[PDB]
Structure 1
Amino acid sequence: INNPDMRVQILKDYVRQHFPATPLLDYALEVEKITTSKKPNLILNVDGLIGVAFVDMLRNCGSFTREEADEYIDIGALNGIFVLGRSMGFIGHYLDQKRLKQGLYRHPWDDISYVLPE
């Protein structure tokens, strides 16, 4: 709680400064208040911060009806955000491995517990 996730900070601060209303974020931050008073690392993480902020955006940006906002969450628009976003990193890695002229991987046997029948 005293050592924040920078990704959370960046977003939290943008959201607070530009969103007209953030009711669900406010609710989540209240839950964070409770959980962090159990164990200090029970912070609202980047997945929680993006999740609730996105709901607040769909609901309170004024472009969607409740029904529409709810349908979009349900049909997994949020999964789309992660998939689309992460696709950049993944392509990045592919290119990186190719450029690094990295050879075929085989997992080492000493890291596998073979518990076969007799």
Structure 2
Amino acid sequence: EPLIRTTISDDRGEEPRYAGYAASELCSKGYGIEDVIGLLWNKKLPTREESEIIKRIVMISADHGPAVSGAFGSILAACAGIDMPQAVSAGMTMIGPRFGGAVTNAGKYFKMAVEDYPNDIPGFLSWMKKNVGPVPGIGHRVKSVKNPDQRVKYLVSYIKNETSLHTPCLDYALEVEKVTTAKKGNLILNVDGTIGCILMDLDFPVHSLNGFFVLARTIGMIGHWIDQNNQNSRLIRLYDYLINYAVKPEQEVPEK
């Protein structure tokens, strides 16, 4: 009775087979990292145009500076003298509802919009406000109509002008963006919404969606760990004035 069942990778031969294809044969025939991602996560070789999109999603989301949770977690561990894989694992642990997770929720709700509200953006927005609250993939702290997110503008322009891919989730999100930005300038289609829609339009299943942010941000977290080690950075201690000690009154311990 086997303990585990696996379907994606076979290491038993002279080299691993990813969804039935020999790793060196993928290399030899000119395939890339983006193609191995499609094979191991979706058991399907991407088409030429899908491959170009996967490559761009990873490149555009590789890093977003040291202030955000994943990179900061990796930096904190690097400065505490932790080895690279363990430091990057601490930063990766930050990926969830507030850091990267909106990719999945945006994919889910824009897919629902296409299926249940195809010719009804007001109905979709009304249902979202009532049942979810803010629309996942809409809104940014600083990026806006006046200050666009070039990561979004580039990905959208590339998929629309350099591919023939039909993108109904992304198309719907772009129509919603026109409405939400008319309400408030900061209500843009953000990079999580963009990637979430594109991945649904590339036929990736809902539970694979987070893989793209996890993998891409690992590139950046490894980079931040290397950077801190190159600088011989010292242990981080949060400055006292950055902490609000809203603690209980000091008390004497009562006798038992």
| Shorter-chain TM band | 0.7 to 0.9
1:67-101 deviations in whole A, cap 9, x for unaligned?
xx5xx21x2x1211101000000000000000001
2 CA distance for matches of 1:113 and 1:3? Answer: 33
Residues 1:103 and 1:35: Cα distance change in structure 2 (over 3 Å): same
Amino acid at match of 2:222: I
Q: Is residue 2:149 matched to residue 1:5?
A: yes
- Runs of 4+ in structure 1 over 6 Å off: none
1:39-89 deviations in whole A, cap 9, x for unaligned?
12211111111110111111xxxxxxxxxx5xx21x2x1211101000000
Instruction: Report 1:1-118 matches (<5 A).
Output: 1-17=145-161, 18-58=163-203, 69=204, 72-73=205-206, 75=207, 77-118=208-249
1:7-36 deviations in whole A, cap 9, x for unaligned?
011100121131421111111111101101
Gapped runs of 5+ residues in structure 2?
A: 1-144, 250-256
Contact 1:19 1:57 in 2 (8 A): no
Counting matched residue pairs gives: 104
Gapped runs of 5+ residues in structure 1?
A: 59-68
Contact 1:28 1:52 in 2 (8 A): yes
Amino acid at match of 1:109: D
User: Identity of aligned pairs, percent?
Assistant: 48
2 CA distance for matches of 1:84 and 1:35? Answer: 30
TM-score normalised by structure 2 residue count: 0.39
2 CA distance for matches of 1:30 and 1:7? Answer: 18
> Which is higher, the Rg of structure 1 or of structure 2?
2
TM-score normalised by structure 1 residue count: 0.81
**CA apart distance, 1:2:** 4.6
2 CA distance for matches of 1:2 and 1:15? Answer: 23
Could you say which structure has the higher helix fraction? 1
